[PDB]
Amino acid sequence: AHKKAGGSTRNGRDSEAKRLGVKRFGGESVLAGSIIVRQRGTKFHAGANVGCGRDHTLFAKADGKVKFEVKGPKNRKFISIEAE
Amino acid sequence: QPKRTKFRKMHKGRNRGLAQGTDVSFGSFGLKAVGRGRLTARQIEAARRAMTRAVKRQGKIWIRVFPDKPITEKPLAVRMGKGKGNVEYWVALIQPGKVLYEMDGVPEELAREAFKLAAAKLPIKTTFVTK
Amino acid sequence: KKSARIRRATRARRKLQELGATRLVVHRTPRHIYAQVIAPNGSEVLVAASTVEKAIAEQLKYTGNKDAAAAVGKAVAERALEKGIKDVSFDRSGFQYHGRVQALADAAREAGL
RNA sequence: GGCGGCCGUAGCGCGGUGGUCCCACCUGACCCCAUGCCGAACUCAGAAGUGAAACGCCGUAGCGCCGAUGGUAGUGUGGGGUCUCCCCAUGCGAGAGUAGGAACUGCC
RNA sequence: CAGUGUCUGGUGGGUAGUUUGACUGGGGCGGUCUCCUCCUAAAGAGUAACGGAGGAGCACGAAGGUUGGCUAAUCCUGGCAUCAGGAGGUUAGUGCAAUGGCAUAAGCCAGCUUGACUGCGAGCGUGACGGCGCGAGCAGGUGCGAAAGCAGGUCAUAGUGAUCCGGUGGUCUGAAUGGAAGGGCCAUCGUCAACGGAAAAGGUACUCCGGGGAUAACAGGCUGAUACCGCCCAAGAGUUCAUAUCGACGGCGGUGUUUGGCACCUCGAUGUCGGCUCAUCACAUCCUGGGGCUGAAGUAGGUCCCAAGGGUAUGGCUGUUC
RNA sequence: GCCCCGGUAAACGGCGGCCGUAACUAUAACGGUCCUAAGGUAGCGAAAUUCCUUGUCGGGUAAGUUCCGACCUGCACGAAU
RNA sequence: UCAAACCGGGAGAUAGCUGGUUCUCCCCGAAAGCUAUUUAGGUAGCGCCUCGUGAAUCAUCUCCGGGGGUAGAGCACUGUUUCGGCAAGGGGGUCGACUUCCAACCCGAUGCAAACUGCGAAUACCGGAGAUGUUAUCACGGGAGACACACGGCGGGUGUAACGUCCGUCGUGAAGAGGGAAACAACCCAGACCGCAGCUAAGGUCCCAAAGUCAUGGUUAAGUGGGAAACGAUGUGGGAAGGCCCAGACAGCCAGGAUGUUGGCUUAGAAGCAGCCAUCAUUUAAAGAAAGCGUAAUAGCUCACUGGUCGAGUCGGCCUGCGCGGAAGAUGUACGGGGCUAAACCAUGCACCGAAGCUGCGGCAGCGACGUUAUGCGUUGUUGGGUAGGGGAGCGUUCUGUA
RNA sequence: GCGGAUUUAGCUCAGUUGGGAGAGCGCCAGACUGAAGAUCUGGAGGUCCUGUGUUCGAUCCACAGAAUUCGCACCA
RNA sequence: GCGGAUUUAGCUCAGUUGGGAGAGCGCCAGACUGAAGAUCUGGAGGUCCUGUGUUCGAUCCACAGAAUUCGCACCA
RNA sequence: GCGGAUUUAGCUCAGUUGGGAGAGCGCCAGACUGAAGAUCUGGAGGUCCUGUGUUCGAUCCACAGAAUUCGCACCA
Predict the structure, then answer these.
(1) Which residues form the signal peptide (chain C)?
(2) Pairing state of beta strands B32-33 and B61-63?
(3) What is the DSSP annotation of A13-74?
(4) Contact predicate B35/B124, CB 8 Å
């Protein structure tokens, strides 16, 4: 029923995440990168996470959220190639 | 030996206990030991009881380090049995420059004779410090 | 990310900011009704008109009714079209339906917004 | 109080002082309109009474958070000895301690 | 009358052919062999052991969606049920293991409502490989919403399985045509959880054989907690007297004769136990020799030191080593 | 034929817990009380069938884990098994 | 010959089980891991090796733009953990108050965490510019081997520990020869065609053994020449710090250790000296109501304390180098041996010996590059080690053709 | 899968003129007996499988569904 | 050491819809009998092994520990 | 030697909130009975193995020693 044995986190296997979409090349508005699911907001390049900063770039495409609270889950403001 | 602490089985009791001395005035004297070493509560008692049984002239004798690290043993076959709590009870961690016993006393040292008796009970060459 | 204080009061709208346009705030006081065409990045007011200013034209009755709410909408919008704005979204933070805010919006469209 | 600019060191606690211009509290619910049980919500109307919640100013830095002047442990990377272990070269440098900041700026 | 020929049901190792799994600090017993989630895994990724802690093989039309109102645990005060006030980011709650997320909320209460739609693509799973899953579009069209928009079931990661055959929804298909009964395309459901799926028990000192000791049961090797012995400090005992003698607690060591552990070595075979016979070596000396102490009057002893040169040697019962 | 019923053991078997009594103490012995029907009546033991065990007492011997006799709760004695 | 004949044939029965099989030379030159498997003494698919064909021009430290939170450290959740004070509850003792003990809360001082963390590396890593490398990078196809590794170092997890199991990175053992280390798979230096000359690396320079029995300075005596530990050490050397020193003290020798008091209590007695408590003062340079011997208790004898006389540095303490005690065993005892006091050790220094290493002459080759019809020349790069394995050339033998 | 039988008060069962729901046992009470027992009497106790349909009205007809039992069929 | 069973009021035991702690015997008292006995009635008698974790609440679930018993293992 | 249990008034035993030393039997006395018996009541009876340590205080904690018992261990 409950949970016992004063223990912390619960484990299993190896993570199933990747680094798809380095971004500096074309990219249709879709989930750039993969780690955890369910998240929206970013509609372009919005790599911004606590640290030395983050980035992405060039690619004119309406929308394009991130994975979730990970590699810059925050939603910055627009960005395209330079001249789409 | 990774520092073990809580979330474990209940073992034995402290062979130690009597903090001794009056806790009305805090001082900064001491008896430092040059070198890191693990001392079990069973040893701390012998050394502590040695000086206390000598400093009958007064008091103000206090200890700062307490035994908090658990150490188990597995007296049996092998495959089965991680480690139970036997003679090897709580053990304290002493740093190369840590003060174990400090008695609140000004140059009237009648405890140097006491600390000497204890210095011969704990494994590690200790030195008497005035500061 | 966490929900900002403004998001907790849901008075703001992030979905209208993803487009990059302007808003049409409708403030209402038990005495007067205000309307503005503010643009993102702070409180940038391009054009605005108060029901009290409607008196400058020739308003006689009270300024806290529905017919007055529609009069202000036509004024704020008329000045907006004179500014250079065409489209705008309705932003009525906290209010009911068919109220004075709807009369303000219906008035804005009547002008050309 | 109105009207702008810059536009996250403005989290969270605490002190003094002023305005009957402005503004909420407040007061009253005839009616539009509205509450599963309650005009409290919701919506309308008037201004008897304050500034007590706001606001304008201004005084403490507690605690959070963001920068700066001083320094040892800690730690890469490559050769030395030594029973273990320790040392040298080279790129940096814990926490404790001394100070900084409690808005800024134009107009009526 | 039955016999005999044929067939059907029941009984039927009496007889015949086989199966009776794998993992597994040998094998067997016990425990496992699918799947999810922390540590271990040593800050990308991946990573083992009967490795430590714990679970899934379902349940649910609502524990779904939207909107309005509201905000919790817990503690304090006035009356533990309830009501009023205060403190209170939140430790509550959110179906399920755990982490992560969330409060003018993704939580609570109430009302309403019900997208779990059809069709077809692009992308994601180092390094190719299916089913399945998920993120993100388009075309048309269901539900809710003012609308953007939100659904491809339940916040995310466990709740699952082929071929053959059968049962269920349009069409195609056998000299020549009609009727009936079949075969096939697409899809759903039914079982293999030793879960990438064979229908099948036992005996073997009556045994036989292939081979082997990357996986155990001896000797060696390392360790040494256990065992043996010593040392330091010395409480206390000994009428008084720590130390003639005995000597705890605690601390520090040596040996490796015991036991335990590991399993690094052997594993291409060096006849067992005990005894007997015969040869050499060692010492932790039981004496003889020379000494110290004594709770040493003497005598006789007790304990200790140097020392092994010699002497240290035997018998009765029992195969028996106590 | 089976289910069902019944005869047959010259097929596999079973025979506990508690209380009172009594004893210098513990046990065995007898009755009952309870559980599941009974709880071993007629006969037989440390036995080549008893581990613990050179079991206990004793004879015998200077001394016998041997033997004999007795007690006996007989780890898992018993009537043509 | 039997818990069951022989012969031949089917048979060249089958096996996921063991083992294995005959010429030369040239070029290049692995994996012992992942997924599935009645699968783990087996295979298949990949990683990895090799060969062939095709295509066509690019790969890489440092800086910049990024992802990480492990080490360390710390405390804000969380689970632990020292002391004092206050308030509430329970229990016990004497009085409805107080005292003692236990648990929870708050405040000021005291301590921690492999599944905590406000912080936070180094470092590993994605992408892009500035070297190196070139038909590479890459595509397709053929043939693979291979899935019992091991060791050193660093970081580990388990274990008392192991020539322990089990991981990770890397270098090696395996194809590292050569040299040093006494001998020695993985320790140090270093990596090979042949022949020749030269110079060095490691190491070594008293002799065996090629090269100094070299230079300056210092230490040790033990032959220490180093298992050898925890532990111990005025054996001896070096360095630093405090205090005391020519008002001759500290030790000898002379003479001197009292008075109230046999302090009290206690005790058969205790009278400085069994024990229990105190330890004052009166008379001086100086004598403790007494540090030991002694008595049954006294007595007696010394010491402390001070003068006379005797006559110079002493005393307390910290640290370091080397040696010593602790170290007890098996047919004759040693650093490789002789042997050595330096041919030891420490701080410096000079000159040499010493490899197939480096340099240089000649010679063979191979591969690849450039130019080329050329595998003919010219020039250029590596230079040219190899088990399994892939590719390529050749000598010899038998018999049958033409010349 | 298929067909047959069965599906009434706790238990075991009767009940087709379609129009009363009933019996035995059991349970409770009474009577009786000193009393308990037995017998006798009395009372309580029924979604008469479920739904729908058929009639004026159905336990008692029709249809559909469920359960029990049985035969048969299936079973690498 | 391994595995299984057991661990409720003095004794012996029942007790899983997790939400009542209960029975027999025994003990005390009553009723009865002259009385004692037996029978009948009534009462008292429970850290339901211990701790912790569960749920609104657990003897009745999970985990850890302890005790009893049995099989096995060990035994120069 | 190793490990476990036990070591309370004469006997058999209870007794962990560490702060009362207690029960049954036995012994003596009383009550009762003619009396003795039984039963009821009352009293006496404890270095709670020994030493030391731990606390304010220990039977009730720690350590050491002794005794009893059981399992195990070594037999020319």
Answers:
(1) none
(2) unpaired
(3) S----B----SSS---SS--SBSS-------S-----TTT---------S----SSSSSS-S
(4) yes
